[PDB]
């Protein structure tokens, strides 16, 4: 749909440097070149596909001192993103927040290994988001005789 | 050179202005408590409000001249916004052709376009194209988070790091790549070797997860009471005891009892070990020592300190109804 | 020649670590509720719009 | 209205479906939409046994 | 060449329990002859209700042609068609048994829908 | 030797383990016929059993997919053979096997008017294929279980064999707890008939 | 011990299709195609 969409793409403003050693070309090569493809989906389906734009540098992308054009009001500056430390449970979602296969966290609850406690809570949310796709159709169901996949698919 | 704040994680809401107006102007009038005909939701400019064809067609469905909905809104929305910024507006329509709408921040889709300064039909589902759309690191889904709030009253609600998911979520629903995710490694830094990078990490981790534990600690005791009753986990119980303590109710109710904290009423050595034993007796948990049995089984979802309040006598010992 | 069964040295009559795979799709008795749950109408469940939106 | 081979081939297509009896023979009937109406095909109401084994 | 009226003779059940390597399969439930545009026309009509992008229709042609005109003689317990996965989809039993429903009223006998692996014949007959 | 005079069947040492009533498992000497010991041999399935071979071989475990699986062959590994082979032996026989029945039927509906009972589906197993096994193993179908079996044409029920997890048998038949037993049943006058 | 794992239980009556439930009915869906020898 194309309302809710921005019409306009302002652009990134670098406020502060995150580092104070400038890289040489070849490390902005060597970097770049290492974020040009990566994996998708996790489980025995893992698939390598190729990232389309990366962007020039990579030590200066997200990590600080860029500000995002996300601003609202008229007296809004734009944010300016701050240290790594600074954002709470950060590196815990580095390890909590990626694609789960439900399969992949439930072996590991009954091995009792888990990478963070999040994952617990990652888990349940799974398991509720499937059955509520079960309650949902139960109640449709019990309106009408809803057939599954007995119609034709496409033109 | 500069590093604005630097702290183990105190950078939770944006700063004060912005939370203050937005406070101002998304908001909620209070729930009148009638009959709602008409529940709406419209995508609509700042400055522009019209009686033109979705707000004004669907308010000539009620007989409602829409000239004045549209009035109060531009004058409540023309200051304060920078332009071409689309807001969600819900109209709820009660029973009395008397109306109330709420104005909020645009769609989380809205915030990610334009953190990626991708414009529309640029991005697209993985396995439908089958390559990923624009990198983005977590520090821009913080600040995409940071604007949406459960309640503007309590921009803290929701805690960030959970709803942090639902942004990265959608995003990664989108197309969207990922740095410190959906990737082995994290955006490398210049100045450090990575020995030190993860020895940071590593204590920065667990520090994050204190300050979070204590977070929903006192965010818990905000809440009403009936949150820091008994509810055991129905996990270490084996399947079989389970159904079968569904096809009577002494079973659960007495396992209820055996195990729950130690607390002056709960507390009888007399009902509890006859409990225990009535337990026993149908094989319910044998090898358990009660004190395991008030580990074991406590509430899972409840955090940490008063979880570890409850297994504890002491601090359990001084809650009595007094007269 | 005649054929028969081997004596059981050890272990259990029907197999357990390699146990097969059922072969019907195990959708859970409690999670597609037909019949083969016997619950006590206390504990009834799902009511969440009916009689457990008003509960005990 | 279309006659199914057994029970099973009955179906509820609307909200407004019901299951009803006649003589003995179950079948579905719609309020609305009558040409949801199905008969699990059975005996003629009236038979003898001569007539209709 | 030239086979009298009995050869290839169906009317035995088979002792061997199919293999099948799709996420789904149709499995032939008794004996008898198929024709082999039949066999197309419930291919036809099974396509129509698969979801292409995520899935592929595997069908077994290879079985022997028996003189009658060209058609298969099949005993109990073969396999027939394949539901083979391209991506992570997963079906429920509801959902595959949907989709072979088109293509098996083209098949001239009865026929049963198996889950991936090999076949439990203990539950399926 | 000779190209008229043909080994009927030669010994093998097997590698892989093979499904079917040929096949064996891995590290049984077992004697097949020419046909599938050759095509056994020549894809590396099978080897000739040379004297160290059958003190030790190497075979291989399907996850890796190459042989690693040193498995020597002592005493206690071959007793284990000879009972493993001894179980899937009465398996494959079974399985194979169709076992033929005549009998009287009289009336109309094509059916046994002396239905069969668990007794004697265990008698033919031993008439037919010499199985010996306790009849209380079989099992009948859910239809058969009210009558007998009674129905002429095919029918079939099922037999439990019950040790094996210790043989270690799975993947190489068809399953680990049973084996469908195919009876067919043709209805005979009283010449060719009992009962 | 052979009785443990194989059953003799007849059941008297066939468990019938639950058309007095409206989900029930829809749920327990046998899709089958009869078929008359050929
Ligand atoms: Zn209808």
Redo the contacts between chains.
């Keep these: 749909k194309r309302t809710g969409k921005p019409a306009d793409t302002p652009d990134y403003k670098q406020v502060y440097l995150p580092y104070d050693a400038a890289p040489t070309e070849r490390e902005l090569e060597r970097e770049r070149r290492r974020f040009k493809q990566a994996y998708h989906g996790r489980m025995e389906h893992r698939k390598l596909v190729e990232v389309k734009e990366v962007p020039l540098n990579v030590y200066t992308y997200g990590k600080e001192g860029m500000s995002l054009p996300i601003a609202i009001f008229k007296d809004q500056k734009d944010p300016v993103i701050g240290p790594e430390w600074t954002y709470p449970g950060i590196y815990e979602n580095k390890i909590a927040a990626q694609h789960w296969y439900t399969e992949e966290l439930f072996d590991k609850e009954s091995k009792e290994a888990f990478e963070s406690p999040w994952q617990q809570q990652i888990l349940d949310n799974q398991v509720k988001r499937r059955m509520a796709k079960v309650m949902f159709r139960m109640r449709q169901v019990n ?3 809803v ?1 599954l996949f007995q119609k034709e698919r496409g033109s | 050179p500069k590093t604005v704040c630097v702290e183990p994680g105190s950078n939770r809401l944006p700063e004060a202005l912005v939370v203050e107006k937005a406070r101002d102007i998304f908001g909620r009038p209070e729930f009148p408590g009638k009959r709602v005909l008409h529940n709406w939701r419209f995508f609509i400019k700042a400055g522009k409000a019209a009686t033109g064809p979705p707000v004004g067609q669907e308010f000539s469905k009620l007989g409602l001249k829409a000239m004045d909905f549209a009035k109060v809104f531009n004058d409540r929305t023309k200051p304060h916004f920078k332009e071409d910024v689309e807001l969600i507006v819900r109209i709820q329509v009660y029973f009395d052709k008397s109306y109330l709408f709420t104005i909020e921040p645009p769609p989380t889709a809205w915030f990610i376009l334009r953190a990626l300064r991708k414009k529309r039909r640029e991005t697209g589902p993985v396995p439908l194209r089958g390559h990923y759309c624009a990198l983005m690191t977590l520090e821009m889904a913080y600040e995409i988070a940071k604007m949406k709030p459960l309640c503007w009253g309590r921009p803290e609600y929701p805690l960030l790091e959970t709803r942090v998911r639902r942004v990265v979520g959608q995003a990664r629903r989108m197309g969207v790549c990922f740095i410190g995710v959906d990737t082995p490694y994290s955006s490398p830094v210049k100045d450090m070797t990575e020995q030190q990078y993860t020895e940071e990490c590593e204590r920065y981790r667990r520090i994050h997860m204190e300050q979070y534990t204590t977070l929903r600690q006192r965010e818990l005791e905000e809440a009403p009471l009936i949150e820091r009753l008994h509810r055991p986990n129905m996990s270490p119980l084996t399947d079989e005891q389970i159904e079968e303590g569904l096809r009577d109710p002494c079973l659960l109710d007495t396992l209820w009892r055996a195990s729950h904290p130690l607390s002056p009423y709960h507390r009888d050595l007399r009902e509890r070990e006859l409990a225990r034993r009535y337990l026993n007796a149908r094989g319910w948990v044998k090898d358990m020592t009660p004190e395991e049995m008030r580990i074991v089984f406590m509430n899972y979802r409840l955090p940490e300190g008063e979880k570890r309040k409850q297994m504890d006598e002491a601090a359990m010992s001084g809650e009595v109804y007094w007269t | 020649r005649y054929y028969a069964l081997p004596h059981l040295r050890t272990g259990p009559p029907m197999p357990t670590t390699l146990e097969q795979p059922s072969g019907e799709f195990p959708w859970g008795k409690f999670s597609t509720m037909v019949g083969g749950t016997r619950i006590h109408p206390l504990y009834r469940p799902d009511g969440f719009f009916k009689d457990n939106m008003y509960p005990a | 209205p279309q006659m199914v ?4 081939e ?6 407004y ?1 019901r ?1 009803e009896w006649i003589h003995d023979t ?1 079948c579905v009937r719609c309020p609305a939409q009558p040409s949801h109406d199905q008969r699990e095909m059975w005996l003629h109401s009236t038979w003898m046994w001569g007539k209709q084994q | 060449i030239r086979q009298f009226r009995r050869y290839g003779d169906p009317r035995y059940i088979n002792n061997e329990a199919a293999l099948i390597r799709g996420q789904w399969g149709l499995i032939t439930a008794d004996f008898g002859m198929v024709t082999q545009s039949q066999m197309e026309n419930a291919r036809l009509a099974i396509l129509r209700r698969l979801p292409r992008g995520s899935f592929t229709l595997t069908m077994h042609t290879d079985y022997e042609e028996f003189p009658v005109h060209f058609a298969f003689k099949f005993t109990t317990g073969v396999p027939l068609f394949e539901i083979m996965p391209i991506s992570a989809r997963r079906l429920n039993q509801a959902e595959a048994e949907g989709i072979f429903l088109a293509g098996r009223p083209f098949i001239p006998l009865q026929t049963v829908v198996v889950p991936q692996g090999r076949v439990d014949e203990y539950h399926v007959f | 030797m000779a190209p008229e005079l043909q080994l009927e069947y030669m010994p093998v040492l097997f590698t892989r383990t093979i499904l079917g009533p040929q096949g064996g498992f891995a590290g049984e000497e077992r004697l097949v016929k020419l046909e599938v010991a050759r095509k056994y041999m020549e894809a590396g399935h099978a080897v000739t059993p040379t004297e160290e071979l059958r003190r030790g071989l190497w075979c291989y475990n399907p996850d890796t997919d190459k042989y690693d699986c040193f498995i020597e062959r002592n005493e206690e590994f071959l007793d284990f053979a000879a009972r493993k082979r001894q179980w899937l032996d009465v398996y494959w026989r079974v399985n194979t096997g169709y076992l033929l029945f005549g009998r009287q039927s009289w009336g109309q509906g094509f059916l046994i008017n002396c239905p069969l009972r668990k007794r004697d589906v265990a008698q033919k197993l031993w008439e037919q294929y010499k199985v010996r096994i306790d009849p209380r193993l079989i099992e009948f179908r859910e239809k058969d279980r009210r009558t007998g079996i009674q129905e002429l044409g095919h029918n079939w029920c099922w037999l439990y064999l019950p040790g094996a997890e210790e043989l270690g048998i799975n993947r190489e038949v068809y399953d680990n707890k049973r084996v469908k037993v195919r009876i067919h049943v043709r209805k005979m006058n009283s010449m060719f008939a009992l009962y | 011990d052979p009785s443990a794992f194989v059953s003799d239980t007849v059941k008297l009556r066939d468990d019938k ?1 639950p ?2 439930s ?1 989900r029930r ?2 749920l327990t ?2 899709f ?1 195609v ?1 078929k008359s020898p050929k």
């Design positions: 309106m009408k005789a057939d | 081979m057994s029970r099973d009955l179906k509820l297509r609307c909200e479906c299951f179950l | 299709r058309y007095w409206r009915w829809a869906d046998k089958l009869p």
